[PDB]
Amino acid sequence: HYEEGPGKNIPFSVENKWRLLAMMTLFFGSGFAAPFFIVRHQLLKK
Template structure:
């Protein structure tokens, strides 16, 4: 009985999903240009990594 219920739910979810054939369609950014993607990811993650260092530098330089 449990197996049939799981199979029904799985079939329903798969039927209602809007998955398109090519990967990356469900992402909020484009993955077509790998160099632009690399630059955007470096800027995004780099800004989060560098922010504490700039904040500490700003606090140390304040008079």
């Protein structure tokens, strides 16, 4: 059986708020950054 309760019903850990900030930063940051880099990709092809 699985862990239950606050902070246990999720696929990411919230044991350390700083490790969490790093996670969330990569997670949301990668999403926001993707379009900019795809635009860059399209401009660098021709």
